Every structure is written in C-alpha cells, then in structure tokens.
From a paper:
N332-GT5 was designed to induce diverse human BG18-class type I precursors. We conclude that N332-GT5 consistently induced BG18-like type I B cell responses in RMs.
We employed cryo-electron microscopy (cryo-EM) to determine whether N332-GT5-induced BG18 type I BCRs engaged the N332-GT5 trimer with a BG18-like binding mode as predicted by the sequence analysis. We determined structures of three BG18 type I Fabs, each containing distinct genetic features, in complex with the N332-GT5 trimer, and we also determined the structure of the unliganded trimer for comparison. The third Fab, RM_N332_32, had a BG18 type I HCDR3 sequence but used a kappa chain V gene, VK1, the most common kappa chain V-gene family among RM-derived BG18 type I antibodies. Structural analysis confirmed that all three Fabs had a binding mode similar to that of the BG18 inferred germline (BG18_GL0), with the HCDR3 engaging the base of V3 and the LC straddling the V1 loop. Overall, we conclude that all three BG18 type I Fabs interacted with N332-GT5 using a BG18-like binding mode, which supports our sequence-based definition of a BG18 type I antibody. Thus, the BG18 type I and III Fabs structurally characterized here have clear potential to develop into BG18-like bnAbs.
Author numbering:
A (entry chain C): 1 to 52, 52A, 53 to 82, 82A, 82B, 82C, 83 to 100, 100A, ...
B (entry chain I), C (entry chain B), D (entry chain G): 520 to 546, 572 to 664
E (entry chain A): 33 to 57, 66 to 141, 150 to 185, 188 to 309, 312 to 323, 323A, 324 to 397, 412 to 457, ...
F (entry chain F): 80 to 127
G (entry chain E): 272 to 309, 312 to 321
The structure:
Amino acid sequence: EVQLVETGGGLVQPGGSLKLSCRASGYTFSSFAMSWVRQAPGKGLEWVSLINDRGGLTFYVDSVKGRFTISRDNSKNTLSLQMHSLRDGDTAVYYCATGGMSSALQSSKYYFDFWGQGALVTV
Amino acid sequence: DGFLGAAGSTMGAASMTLTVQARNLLSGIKQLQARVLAVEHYLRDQQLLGIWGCSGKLICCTNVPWNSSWSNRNLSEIWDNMTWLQWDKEISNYTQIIYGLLEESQNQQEKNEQDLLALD
Amino acid sequence: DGFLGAAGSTMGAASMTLTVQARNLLSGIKQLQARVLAVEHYLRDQQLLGIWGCSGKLICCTNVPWNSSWSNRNLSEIWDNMTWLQWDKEISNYTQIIYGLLEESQNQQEKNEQDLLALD
Amino acid sequence: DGFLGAAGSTMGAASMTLTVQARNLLSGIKQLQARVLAVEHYLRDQQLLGIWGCSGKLICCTNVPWNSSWSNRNLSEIWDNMTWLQWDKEISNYTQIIYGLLEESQNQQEKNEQDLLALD
Amino acid sequence: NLWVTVYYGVPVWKDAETTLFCASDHNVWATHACVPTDPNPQEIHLENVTEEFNMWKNNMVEQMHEDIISLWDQSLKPCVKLTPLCVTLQCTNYAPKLRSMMRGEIKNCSFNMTTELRDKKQKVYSLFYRLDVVQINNKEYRLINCNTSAITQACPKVSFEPIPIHYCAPAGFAILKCKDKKFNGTGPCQNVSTVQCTHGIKPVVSTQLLLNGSLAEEEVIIRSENITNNAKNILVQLNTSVQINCTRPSNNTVKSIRIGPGQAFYYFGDVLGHVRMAHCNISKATWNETLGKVVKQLRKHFGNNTIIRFAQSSGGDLEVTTHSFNCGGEFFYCNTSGLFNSTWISDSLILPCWIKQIINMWQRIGQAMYAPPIQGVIRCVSNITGLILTRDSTTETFRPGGGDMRDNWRSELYKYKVVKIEPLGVAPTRCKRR
Amino acid sequence: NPQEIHLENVTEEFNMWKNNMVEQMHEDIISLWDQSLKPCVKLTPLCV
Amino acid sequence: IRSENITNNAKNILVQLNTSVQINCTRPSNNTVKSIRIGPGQAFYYFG
Ligand SMILES: *[C@@H]1O[C@H](CO)[C@@H](O[C@@H]2O[C@H](CO)[C@@H](O[C@@H]3O[C@H](CO)[C@@H](O)[C@H](O[C@H]4O[C@H](CO)[C@@H](O)[C@H](O)[C@@H]4O)[C@@H]3O)[C@H](O)[C@H]2NC(C)=O)[C@H](O)[C@H]1NC(C)=O
Ligand SMILES: *[C@@H]1O[C@H](CO)[C@@H](O)[C@H](O)[C@H]1NC(C)=O
Ligand SMILES: *[C@@H]1O[C@H](CO)[C@@H](O)[C@H](O)[C@H]1NC(C)=O
Ligand SMILES: *[C@@H]1O[C@H](CO)[C@@H](O)[C@H](O)[C@H]1NC(C)=O
Ligand SMILES: *[C@@H]1O[C@H](CO)[C@@H](O)[C@H](O)[C@H]1NC(C)=O
Ligand SMILES: *[C@@H]1O[C@H](CO)[C@@H](O)[C@H](O)[C@H]1NC(C)=O
Ligand SMILES: *[C@@H]1O[C@H](CO)[C@@H](O)[C@H](O)[C@H]1NC(C)=O
Ligand SMILES: *[C@@H]1O[C@H](CO)[C@@H](O)[C@H](O)[C@H]1NC(C)=O
Ligand SMILES: *[C@@H]1O[C@H](CO)[C@@H](O)[C@H](O)[C@H]1NC(C)=O
Ligand SMILES: *[C@@H]1O[C@H](CO)[C@@H](O)[C@H](O)[C@H]1NC(C)=O
Ligand SMILES: *[C@@H]1O[C@H](CO)[C@@H](O)[C@H](O)[C@H]1NC(C)=O
Ligand SMILES: *[C@@H]1O[C@H](CO)[C@@H](O)[C@H](O)[C@H]1NC(C)=O
Ligand SMILES: *[C@@H]1O[C@H](CO)[C@@H](O)[C@H](O)[C@H]1NC(C)=O
Ligand SMILES: *[C@@H]1O[C@H](CO)[C@@H](O)[C@H](O)[C@H]1NC(C)=O
Ligand SMILES: *[C@@H]1O[C@H](CO)[C@@H](O)[C@H](O)[C@H]1NC(C)=O
Ligand SMILES: *[C@@H]1O[C@H](CO)[C@@H](O)[C@H](O)[C@H]1NC(C)=O
Ligand SMILES: *[C@@H]1O[C@H](CO)[C@@H](O)[C@H](O)[C@H]1NC(C)=O
Ligand SMILES: *[C@@H]1O[C@H](CO)[C@@H](O)[C@H](O)[C@H]1NC(C)=O
Ligand SMILES: *[C@@H]1O[C@H](CO)[C@@H](O)[C@H](O)[C@H]1NC(C)=O
Ligand SMILES: *[C@@H]1O[C@H](CO)[C@@H](O)[C@H](O)[C@H]1NC(C)=O
Ligand SMILES: *[C@@H]1O[C@H](CO)[C@@H](O)[C@H](O)[C@H]1NC(C)=O
Ligand SMILES: *[C@@H]1O[C@H](CO)[C@@H](O)[C@H](O)[C@H]1NC(C)=O
Ligand SMILES: *[C@@H]1O[C@H](CO)[C@@H](O)[C@H](O)[C@H]1NC(C)=O
C-alpha cells in the first residue's frame, strides 16, 4: 500500500535548474526520513541526498553540496529537490526512497525501505 | 566604572561592563522574605537563560532573526546613539514574543542535535 | 499543551514539552520554609545535572551504556507504547545505579579532557 | 572515600574526589536564616564560576598564565608534595588578583567569540 | 546499542505533603495574610491519567484545620478579656409570667462588676441564657466558664460570616482534581485534571448537617473510611439542597458598660416585645424525599432485605447531641430529633433551638469564648448539602453523630490530592556523547 | 566607606509623595517603639 | 585538667575524671501533694 509518485521535469541545458517532487501515500509521511538516489542511464546506483523526518537536517553527496537543495512539507506529504547547474554528467533517473535515517528514538535503519519509480532528468 | 556607571553610556559601550551589574544581584521576617524572593527571581532569570541555550554566558547569540517590525532602526543608531534604558522602552511591547521564539528555536536545536548524534 | 498536559502522552511525544514543566518549578513562617525548601530542591536537581556534564540542557545524551537488566524492552515499545509515569515505575529500583555511573563517567571525561588539552 | 576524606591527600590525589565535596553543599527563624544564607553563598560561588566561562565544570582550564611571583614552586612539588589546605595558605594573598584576571580574560573571550561569529 | 539519555522536565510526580498557601479575593476568616486570587485560574485536563485518590489520608485536611484554628485565635486575641465576670450572680427569672417555651430560659442576674477606676464598683443588671449559668447553692449562680477557663470577649466589629478560601500549591507542586462523577472517595479517578488552586471553600462550622457545601452531580453519594467498622463516620453528600429557614424572632437589644481603662463589656438588654423561642423550619416533604433517597442509596452496602432506622443522638452535651450553627453572628443549637425518627422497611417541620453565649469551639478545654449579643431580630436561610451519620440482626439504626470538624471539610476536599513534581529521569536512546 | 557612583546623562523622574520608603520607615519606627516599651512596668494600679 | 589560663586565678579549672564516682541521693520522706483551685482554669499545687 506504500507508494511514492515522482512528478519531475524533462530536458534542461547546463546552467539552468530543475525541481523534482515526490508525493507519498500509504504511510505516515512525518514518521520516516526520505532521500534521493541517482542512477545514470548506463551505471549503477548512487546516493545523492538525505533529509530527516522533520526537514531540519539535510546531507548531500560531495558532488552536489553546492548545487542541490532538499526540502519537504509534512502537511502536503511532499518531498522536493531543487537542482542547479545540471551538467551533462547529471543525466540520470532520480528515485525517491523512504529510509536511510532514524531520529534517535526509533530503531536503526541505515537502509532504503521503500522506492518510487523515478523521474528521468536529462541534459 | 562602578555599579550602573554605564547607565548613561551607549549600548555598544555599556555592554563592556555587564559583569559589574551581574555581580551585584547576589551581594526580621520581612528581610528574610525579601532575600528569599530575590533568590527566586535570580533563579528565574537563570532558568530563562538556560532554556534558551545560553548557560554560562553574559553575551549570547541566537538563531532568531530580527523581524524589523519590533524596531526598524539602523544597527549603528541602536548601538552608538542609544542607551539601554531607552532601548528597554522602545521594545517593551515585544519581549514576550522574542522570548517565545527563543524557547522554540532552542527546542528545535536540542532535538536536532539529539538526532544528529545518533548517526553511528 | 499546558502544565502536565503530556502526562498521559507517550514518552516520545511527552518529551516535546519538557520546557513547559521546567518553567513551573520556580513560578507565615510555614510558607517561607516551604519556599526555601523548594529552592533547595531545585538547586539539588541542577547540581545533580551539572555533575553529569549536562548544564544548560533539557535533553542530554551520555556515554553510559544501557545494561538491559534495567529494562529489556524494545526501544519502540518504550518510546511509543509507554508514558513517563509508567516508565518511572519500571526502573524505580535502578536510578541510584544509573546516577552513580553517570557521575563516574563525567569524572573520567573531565580528567581526559584536562589531559588532552595539555598537548601543546 | 567520604566527605573531606581527601583533606590530608596530595592535591593530585585529592582532586579525584571533587564531586564528593560538591554534593555536600546543598545536602526556628535562626535555622531558616542559616539555610537562606547557605543558598546565597552557593549561588555566589556558582555565579563566580559562571562569569569565568566555567559553567557545568568541576575542573576548568583557563587562559590566565601563572605569574610565578604567586608561587614559584615546581609543578611536581605542588601537585605531589602538598595538600589543598597548605596550598590555600601559600596563595591566600593572591586570590583576588587571580579572580580579577579570570574575569577580564573571560570578557575578552566572549567579545572575540561574538565578533568571530559575525563572519557570514 | 542503547545509551542512557537524561531528561529534565519529565511530566511525572510522587505523592507528597507540603504547605499550601491561602488565596482569597473586618472578618475572622478574611485577614490580610492571604494572596489575592487569579481572576482567570487555569485547569488542564489530563487525558489517559488514572490516579488513585484517598480522601481519608489527605494531608490537606489537617492543614486547613490548623489554619482555621490559627485565624480564629489571632482574631480573638486582641480583644477584651472578661476575667471580672467570675463573681457571684444573683438571678431571678426574667419573665415569671411566661406560659410558653423560654420560661426559665432567660434569667435576670445582678452582679457588681468593676469600673474604670480600681477604687469603685458598680451594680449591673443583665440577662443570661440558662445554658450559660449554673447554680452554686433569687438564687446564687456562676458562669460555666469559671469552672475551667476565663473568657475572651469577641470583638463586636469582626464578622463571623463564612468567606470562601482557595488553597494554592507552592511552586514545584501540583493539585490534582478527581472530577469523577459518583466518586467513591477512594480509588482511581478517570477524569483527573490539574488545577492551580482549589475552588473556594467556605469555612462553615456546623454539626450533624453540613451547610452551604457542594452538592453531588448525579446521585446521593455515601462515603466512609470503613463501612463495617461502626466507629467511623459516614458522610452523605446530597445531589439536591434542602432549604433551612432559621430565626431568632425576638427584637433583642444590646447594652454596654465600661469595665476598665480601655475595656468595655457588652450584654443582653431588654426585649422590645414578646419573648419568643428561637427556632428553625425545614420543609417536611423535601426532607422526607431526601431521607428516602439516602436510604435507597444506603441499602447498597447492607442489602435489599434489611430495615434502615433513623434515631436522634444519645449522649453528650449540646455540642454533639444537637445541630449547631452560626446564624447572623448568633450561635444556635437545634434539637433535630424530629428529623431522625423513622423506620424504612423494603407542610413544615419546626425544630426548637436554644441560644448560648459561652462557647467552647473546636472541642478544646481551657479556652472559652463569649459571643456578644446582636441587636435586632435574626433570620437566615441555609442549604443542607450533606449529612453525617453513624452506625449503632437485620435492622440497622443510624444517628446524626458528628462533632469532629475535620469531617465537615473532607466532604469538600475529597476531590483534591497534592503531588510533587520530580522532573528528572533517564531513558535509553541511540545517542552517544561522541 | 560607603560608595556613591555618579550617573552621567541619566534623568530619572522622582516623586516624593508616592515614595514607598516613607511607609516602611514609619512602620519600622512604630515597631521599634512598641518593642522597647513592651518589656516594662504596666501601671494599671494608677486608675484610682 | 583544663583551663583557659592556669596562672590567672580568675579562671575556672575543669577536671575530667577517667573513672566515675557513684552518688546515691535521696529524700526519704513520704511526701504528699495537695492542690486547690485559684481561678477560672488555674490550680495551685502545694506541700501536704
Ligand atoms: C449560607 O449562606 C447564606 C447566604 O447564601 C447565609 O445567609 C446570609 O447570612 C448573611 C450574614 O448573616 C446575611 O447578611 C446579613 O443580612 C442582613 C439583612 O438585614 C444585614 O442587616 C446584615 O448586616 C450585617 O453586615 C453589614 C455589612 O455592611 C453591617 O453593616 C451590619 O451592621 C451587620 O453586621 C448582613 O448583611 C444574609 O442576608 C444571609 N442571606 C439570606 C438569604 O438570608 C447563611 O448564613 C449561610 N449559612 C451559615 C451557616 O452561615
Ligand atoms: C554622556 O554624554 C557625553 C557627551 O555627549 C559623552 O561624552 C559620554 O560618553 C556620555 N556618557 C557618559 C556615561 O558620560
Ligand atoms: C513579524 O511580525 C508580524 C506581526 O507583528 C507578523 O505578522 C510577521 O509574520 C512577522 N514576520 C516574520 C518573518 O515572522
Ligand atoms: C490518549 O489516548 C488516545 C487514544 O489512544 C490517544 O490518541 C492520545 O494521544 C493519548 N494521549 C492523550 C494525551 O490524549
Ligand atoms: C548489569 O547489571 C548486573 C547486576 O544487575 C551486573 O552484574 C552486570 O555486570 C551489569 N553489566 C554491565 C555490562 O555492567
Ligand atoms: C598520609 O600519609 C601517608 C604516609 O606518607 C600516605 O601514604 C597517605 O597517602 C597520606 N594521605 C592519607 C589521606 O592518608
Ligand atoms: C607579576 O606580578 C607583579 C606584581 O606582583 C607585576 O608587577 C608583574 O607585572 C606581574 N607579571 C605579569 C606577567 O603580569
Ligand atoms: C454587690 O456588692 C455589694 C457590696 O456591699 C453587696 O452588698 C451586693 O450584694 C453585691 N451584689 C450582688 C448581686 O452580689
Ligand atoms: C465543673 O467541672 C467539672 C470537671 O472539671 C465537672 O465534672 C463539673 O460538672 C463542672 N460543674 C458543673 C456545674 O457542670
Ligand atoms: C471521564 O471523562 C469522559 C470525557 O469527558 C466522560 O465521558 C466520562 O463519563 C468521565 N468519567 C466519569 C466517571 O464521569
Ligand atoms: C438525585 O438522585 C436520585 C437518586 O438517588 C435521583 O432520583 C434524582 O433525580 C437526583 N436528582 C437530581 C436533581 O439529579
Ligand atoms: C470503594 O470501592 C472499593 C472497591 O475496590 C470498596 O472496597 C470500598 O469499600 C469502596 N468505598 C466505599 C466508601 O464504599
Ligand atoms: C473495616 O472494619 C472491619 C471491622 O471488623 C475490619 O475487620 C476490616 O478489616 C476493616 N477494613 C480494613 C480495610 O481494614
Ligand atoms: C426593634 O425595636 C427598635 C426600637 O427602636 C425598632 O427601631 C426596630 O424596628 C424594631 N425591630 C423589629 C424587628 O421589631
Ligand atoms: C431585672 O430586674 C430588675 C428588678 O428591679 C429590673 O429593674 C430590671 O429591669 C430587670 N432587667 C431587665 C433587663 O429588665
Ligand atoms: C423558607 O423561606 C423561603 C423564602 O425566603 C420560602 O420560599 C420557603 O418556602 C421557606 N421554607 C420553609 C420550610 O419555611
Ligand atoms: C414519606 O415518609 C413515609 C414514612 O413516614 C414514607 O413511607 C414515604 O415513602 C415518604 N415519602 C417519600 C416521597 O419518600
Ligand atoms: C429533643 O427533644 C426531645 C423531645 O421531643 C427530647 O426528648 C430530647 O432529649 C431533645 N434533645 C436534646 C438534645 O435536647
Ligand atoms: C441553595 O440551593 C438553591 C437551589 O435550590 C441555590 O440556588 C442557592 O444558591 C443555594 N444556596 C447556597 C448558599 O448555596
Ligand atoms: C596546652 O599546651 C600549651 C603548650 O604549647 C600550654 O602553653 C598550655 O598552657 C596548655 N594548656 C593547658 C590548659 O594546660
Ligand atoms: C595568663 O594569666 C597571667 C596572669 O598574670 C598573665 O600574665 C598571662 O599573660 C596570661 N596568659 C596569656 C596567654 O595571656
Ligand atoms: C507513702 O504513703 C502512701 C499512702 O497511700 C503509700 O501508698 C505509699 O506506699 C507510701 N510510700 C512509702 C515509700 O512509704
Ligand atoms: C498546720 O496547723 C494546723 C493547725 O490547726 C493543722 O490543722 C494543719 O494540719 C497543719 N498542717 C499540716 C500540713 O498538718
């Protein structure tokens, strides 16, 4: 019953920007941390960004520390990612996932529990 | 200078002697009652600072932004052209709001630190 | 919520309002004696926190491991399926041991920091 | 050991039990007056430590250098061949100077930190 | 895996006893040593909290008792001390031709008494009630107080009208209010709510029938420490009030004389009209219905095949054998035997009352009080809000009992408990101090 | 050697008619007077 | 033997013994006590 639905963009050129968004259903949104995982068309998986359940602590992979902003709205059950510059090497499918962190009073996670289907971002 | 010597000094100069006033807060049933009340008020001020994340500090910076409506004066007019007695009057109607904002921002900071420390 | 409004809330929810209870601890010889005793007990609790390395904090993490025998419940049962009133009863027989362990670990931490700072 | 058990111990050994003495400071009008006075003196000592930048600490290092004239003994003679009762007598004539220096160095540290945090 | 985390501000508490302070918005129970009340006091409902209450072990009752004793003694202390009244009185009947009650109840007593100067005595004629005067053997009599205690004359300027007093917790403590409809008096409460202070409680002094108290919300509630043990009192809280109309119809006058350099004595004067018996009326149908409700609820603890009988008091003096109250500043003692004479098997009632001026309150011996007479006709209207009953085969006989004033305050304080906040505790979390 | 610290550029408003120090001084004098007279001979025998 | 000053004859000497000496004190007479009332709540006790 858990579902994450990507509503992303399309093709942009280097120097522009693109905002991705995911809608969540089937679980309490505010109870889980969420993250973005990137997969280039011909490559494997890599982690890009992590946001905690309250949207107060954010972490990024070094390659995007100065380019991407991750935010969430717990009343809308919406996760979003604002990506700047978008170079040729950033073409990939961007997946939302639930898991990756737990807010001290919850049991340990350190894994991605649920996955969406992925938005395709091209350059 | 001595106790309250800076009362007529500007805020940016008066802040240099905060210790002088701080040390003068602790230094016959009616007199015993007055002493107990003074102790309770001292502790209430220390508790209020403690719940803001400002413990052993006389000058403490916070993460609450200034909302301008409280006072829209230039920073140099407040610190160089005002005394603390005047400033205490200009914003006397906003101190409860600021105190509430400080308490909330400290609660958020403590919860975020507790969660941040859990990342093995 | 208001004072003790969270008494029936779960521990993981009740901890959100610690400030509300903290602010209500300070807010005719018999009455003066009661006030002096209340002040002494407040200070004893603050001293006890101070000797553990938890000064201006409402939530404070320590380096004492949980020994399981004190309580072997799952973390999610304690924080989501228990109130603080019940928890205070389950471990009422172990608080002296935990307090002693916290005092010892703080003594070790302070001595190690004092020695660490000496490395020119 | 127990309360004041370390009184005859050397300084480098006696410092191991600071908590033991710290916990014994808080633990009929004349008796009520004595209790209020004891509370005021406890708070005066805590305030004095607070204005030096030493809040929740029993051992606190500072940036005031030792001027030698206060005591020109070798470090190992002070810590291994002296008790705290003797040391309290050797430098009983210099504690006001040291306290003033500590207060000034804390004022300088707090102002420098306030300015350092402003570098956007 | 898990580490100890310290939390301060934890919403937990322990049972505790402490000193509560007075709060209230001349008068014996309204002194200046009381904190003005909060015009908008707070109440915080506690969801999912089931605290255990015990009205019979509630330390608030002893403090309230001591505070009332202290206020009473403080108010009576700075007043005239009537040691000169321990003299021989020469008394005759006030109204030798009376053919009604009060015949022989009021005596016209002559005595000397001192004056402003120590070298001269006066001659004073005054009236006393029979209950205040005992024969020595126109007959010689003395006041009852000269047997055990000198009397302090109450200051005529200090009212005895009950004024509600609120009790407030000191910092660090909280008061929990049961709010459980049909509360047993002991046991868990499902509607526990935290309050800053209690409701106002009137320090009403009475025996046998509780006056101007709180009513039950759903039904008559019968509470006792132990029902089986016949030595315990039973407090019956009614869900309706019964209106009581008490009066002293005589148009009494007050005279006064000087007795010393700055002291004056007030005494009963003449009667500007007929001498009449003090009395009090209770509606008959209302009382019968109320008593029927009490028996209906009382049967639940004894059985539905029993006989519940009511009878008047047995031994003791008028402090415990009769109903007593302060009406208009006068002290009335009423027979009540017409209220408790019935057997219960599965338009206006008039009670005579006597007036007594020599008072020994709080069941103390050695500290007598003299109530000055009040000029004029006295009438008051009171509410019966509860009864005190004692136990005395399938037939059970109940009597008014009473006399211990703490029983008159538990009926109001039964819903409050004092707890101490201990806002410090530990819990395991996945959080290490680096 | 009591201290006095002059306050430069301070203009406080005073009101001698609403000064609570007067009532305390009055009560303190009454208290001292009564305390001193209390432990003394009470001459009630002179009302002759 | 302890004193503030032995030379000064105005000071007292306190001698603390290392053994106790047993003292047997008595009032052998079989004394009675009588009492009378003297006022409204007062009574005086006297040798009978
Ligand atoms: C239970 O509560 C009822 C009230 O609900 C209470 O009855 C009331 O008692 C008071 C005090 O006895 C009555 O107040 C008096 O009313 C008469 C009216 O003629 C006044 O003359 C009285 O005057 C006194 O107070 C004045 C204050 O200014 C003085 O100037 C004057 O000299 C007197 O000292 C006084 O105001 C009140 O009228 C009754 N209420 C009714 C409806 O009768 C009852 O007593 C309570 N129960 C018990 C056991 O106390
Ligand atoms: C008072 O005013 C003078 C003149 O403007 C100024 O120099 C001084 O710093 C002010 N403050 C004090 C404390 O004198
Ligand atoms: C500033 O205060 C006003 C009310 O005085 C409020 O409406 C506004 O939202 C505040 N601004 C911010 C940024 O909080
Ligand atoms: C009380 O119980 C209800 C029902 O389980 C729950 O929703 C609520 O959070 C609990 N706590 C409080 C304070 O109501
Ligand atoms: C846990 O507590 C028991 C006693 O209750 C003790 O024997 C044991 O050593 C403790 N474990 C640790 C790791 O300290
Ligand atoms: C006292 O002196 C002895 C002998 O030098 C030494 O061993 C001991 O540590 C000293 N201190 C105490 C507290 O006994
Ligand atoms: C040491 O103290 C003396 C006075 O006792 C003073 O003259 C000297 O300057 C001090 N030294 C330092 C480095 O402050
Ligand atoms: C009052 O004193 C006089 C003294 O001569 C005495 O004769 C008289 O009988 C006394 N009155 C009473 C009522 O005893
Ligand atoms: C006087 O007091 C005694 C007890 O002290 C009592 O027995 C006696 O009955 C009293 N006198 C009268 C007339 O009641
Ligand atoms: C307790 O409170 C609830 C909610 O107000 C109410 O429905 C229930 O009847 C109360 N319990 C009693 C015994 O009155
Ligand atoms: C009082 O309780 C009785 C039951 O004993 C009930 O019949 C009556 O209606 C109640 N009165 C009110 C006003 O609720
Ligand atoms: C209250 O209920 C309990 C049932 O646990 C009962 O034993 C007790 O006697 C009751 N109290 C009264 C006063 O009836
Ligand atoms: C109540 O009184 C009876 C009297 O016989 C006694 O047996 C019973 O134990 C008492 N109740 C309690 C709880 O002690
Ligand atoms: C009582 O008598 C006085 C005499 O002056 C009169 O004024 C008053 O009205 C009378 N009161 C009654 C109730 O008769
Ligand atoms: C008491 O009797 C005397 C007898 O002469 C009389 O004068 C006096 O008026 C009577 N007392 C009263 C109150 O009438
Ligand atoms: C008591 O007096 C009121 C009016 O004040 C009246 O309505 C009521 O019926 C009276 N009751 C009795 C029993 O006299
Ligand atoms: C009135 O009293 C009689 C007993 O004298 C009783 O049988 C009857 O039920 C009572 N009426 C009511 C309404 O209780
Ligand atoms: C009450 O009156 C009855 C007569 O109806 C009498 O037998 C009883 O002794 C009286 N009780 C008191 C306490 O005076
Ligand atoms: C007595 O009861 C009536 C309701 O019948 C109520 O209106 C009145 O206020 C009550 N009196 C007191 C003093 O509580
Ligand atoms: C105690 O000993 C000292 C020796 O220093 C001596 O002077 C003093 O008098 C002695 N005290 C007594 C009471 O003998
Ligand atoms: C003891 O008393 C003698 C008396 O002559 C005096 O000379 C001596 O100084 C006293 N001792 C001290 C220590 O003062
Ligand atoms: C003293 O005399 C009384 C007289 O009753 C007697 O009981 C008592 O034993 C006597 N005691 C001695 C010691 O003779
Ligand atoms: C004192 O002397 C009188 C003389 O009659 C005698 O009766 C009395 O008993 C004596 N006192 C005692 C205590 O015997």
